[PDB]
Amino acid sequence: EAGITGTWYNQLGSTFIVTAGADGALTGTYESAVGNAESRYVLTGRYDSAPATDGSGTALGWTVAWKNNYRNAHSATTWSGQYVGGAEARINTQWLLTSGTTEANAWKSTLVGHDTFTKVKP
Amino acid sequence: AGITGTWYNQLGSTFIVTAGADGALTGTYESAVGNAESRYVLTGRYDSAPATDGSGTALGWTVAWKNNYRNAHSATTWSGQYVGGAEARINTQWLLTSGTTEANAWKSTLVGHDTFTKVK
Amino acid sequence: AEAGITGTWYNQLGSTFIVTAGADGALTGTYESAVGNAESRYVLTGRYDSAPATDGSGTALGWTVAWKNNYRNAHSATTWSGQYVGGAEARINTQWLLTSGTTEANAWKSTLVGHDTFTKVK
Amino acid sequence: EAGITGTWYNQLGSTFIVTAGADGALTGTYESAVGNAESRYVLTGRYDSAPATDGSGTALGWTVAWKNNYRNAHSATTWSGQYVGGAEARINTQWLLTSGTTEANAWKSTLVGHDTFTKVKP
Numbered sequence A, D: 001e002a003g004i005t006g007t008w009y010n011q012l013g014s015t016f017i018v019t020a021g022a023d024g025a026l027t028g029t030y031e032s033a034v035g036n037a038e039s040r041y042v043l044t045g046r047y048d049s050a051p052a053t054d055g056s057g058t059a060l061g062w063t064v065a066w067k068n069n070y071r072n073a074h075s076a077t078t079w080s081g082q083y084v085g086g087a088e089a090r091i092n093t094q095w096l097l098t099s100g101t102t103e104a105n106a107w108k109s110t111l112v113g114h115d116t117f118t119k120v121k122p
Numbered sequence B: 001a002g003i004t005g006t007w008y009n010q011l012g013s014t015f016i017v018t019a020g021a022d023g024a025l026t027g028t029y030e031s032a033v034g035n036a037e038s039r040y041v042l043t044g045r046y047d048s049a050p051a052t053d054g055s056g057t058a059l060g061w062t063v064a065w066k067n068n069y070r071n072a073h074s075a076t077t078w079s080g081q082y083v084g085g086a087e088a089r090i091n092t093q094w095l096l097t098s099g100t101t102e103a104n105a106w107k108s109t110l111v112g113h114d115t116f117t118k119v120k
Numbered sequence C: 001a002e003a004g005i006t007g008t009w010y011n012q013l014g015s016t017f018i019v020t021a022g023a024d025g026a027l028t029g030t031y032e033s034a035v036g037n038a039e040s041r042y043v044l045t046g047r048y049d050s051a052p053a054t055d056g057s058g059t060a061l062g063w064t065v066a067w068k069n070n071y072r073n074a075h076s077a078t079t080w081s082g083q084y085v086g087g088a089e090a091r092i093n094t095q096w097l098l099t100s101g102t103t104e105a106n107a108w109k110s111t112l113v114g115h116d117t118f119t120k121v122k
């Protein structure tokens, strides 16, 4: 909720800096430790601003297009996942990284993986 | 943009989007299926300087399935590419994550693929 | 059993899937890809629901190819997970995961994801 | 032939018992700790029987159809991933669980997740 805003780090050492707005907006920057990336990229996404009463995770997702002032990878990643708060707060995601490709190469356009974000660098 | 406009997928969902000069996607999504009614806000990003060698334009966007009427406690992200020209298409794969208790997290996420066209 | 599975199938990429469905759930056959790091036929094995529902629902199944044969070794494996539907427009509708062997540093980009639809003609 | 051969457990406590044959076969049983499943199910799959020698993992995949003598969930899972040997040996996977569905429900036929296996008995 409010618990989402701030800096998060994944298992690769990437840095996810986000603000969760009152009704569901996510805005911030992403800096990847790997791949065809340097410095920060804009991200935007959405989260459930009124998660379930049973303490289920807070669903959210966000997108990075891998273009910034320094570099353009011609690709975009979406992370889809859920935030869980508490002493071991986490954002558990799966992601789809699509590169722009010709139609013939479209079958190999999309990588899939999973990132776990924590409040401390692993 | 190119990307800007009203799109429909194979399910009959409606994707109304505007592509900004800064790489932003903004608009609304209305799903023909699932735990959804009416329009939901979406935001996303696209490559605003794509390759000129015939490649598609990479993009993605998110919907959290809460609006003024309903809350599914879930979010879909679509990742894909825009292919322009006479019969422009957006081809995607998506991940739908539901918020879940710890016991149910293994089954939190559905995966699929949606193809969008501007044909009503 | 689901006798409708056994035979030759073709996907939208021009690949050929030749399979035998055993009475109690075995899939065995060969796969020839029209794309990627692949030449000639590769062994496949998998499983299917040999007593599917009779309400018109599909028959769940999946199979694996490791991309090594007598000609070539791509150091990768693909699994297709999907469902068979019979009738006049019989199809096997799948999603797949193609994992390459990688070093630990490159494991984040080990897996491609996509979808293939197999039909009895094309 | 085999590092891969053995009894493995994932983060859910599920048990994967596998034999890796000299030419690329995987056979064994799977018991899920979760879902519409009880006791053991047959699996088959394939792995790269001549992996790279540069420190890369060994690609593999396998399928379970969730029908056995006790229960039938009309579903199948495939795991695609790689085996990383040494200490601590691990098989890192992503999986697709497809249920047989009507055409109207096919959009929600397939779950996706990731399982990591080790030889450590919970």
Ligand SMILES: O=C(O)CCCC[C@H]1[C@H]2NC(=O)N[C@H]2C[S@@]1=O
Residues within 6 Å of the ligand: A010, A012, A014, A031, A032, A033, A034, A035, A036, A037, A066, A073, A075, A076, A077, A095, A096, A097, A113, A115, C108
């Ligand atoms: O190589 C590219 O096309 C851009 C960089 C992609 C970095 C990926 C990698 N970094 C990260 O923090 N999680 C994974 C998923 S993100 O697509």
Ligand SMILES: O=C(O)CCCC[C@H]1[C@H]2NC(=O)N[C@H]2C[S@@]1=O
Residues within 6 Å of the ligand: A107, C011, C013, C015, C032, C033, C034, C035, C036, C037, C038, C067, C074, C076, C077, C078, C096, C097, C098, C114, C116
């Ligand atoms: O490049 C490789 O590593 C081996 C060949 C992969 C071919 C892929 C491609 N061919 C096909 O019929 N469907 C898709 C998914 S399979 O992983």
Ligand SMILES: O=C(O)CCCC[C@@H]1SC[C@@H]2NC(=O)N[C@@H]21
Residues within 6 Å of the ligand: B009, B011, B013, B030, B031, B032, B033, B034, B035, B036, B065, B072, B074, B075, B076, B094, B096, B112, B114, D107
């Ligand atoms: O059921 C839910 O949790 C919310 C609605 C989900 C609808 C999904 S999003 C992916 C797919 N494409 C669509 O247009 N609708 C379904």
Ligand SMILES: O=C(O)CCCC[C@@H]1SC[C@@H]2NC(=O)N[C@@H]21
Residues within 6 Å of the ligand: B106, D010, D012, D014, D031, D032, D033, D034, D035, D036, D037, D066, D073, D075, D076, D077, D095, D097, D113, D115
């Ligand atoms: O519920 C079903 O349809 C059958 C059981 C599915 C269990 C899944 S397979 C992927 C994940 N890993 C496991 O060890 N169990 C769950």
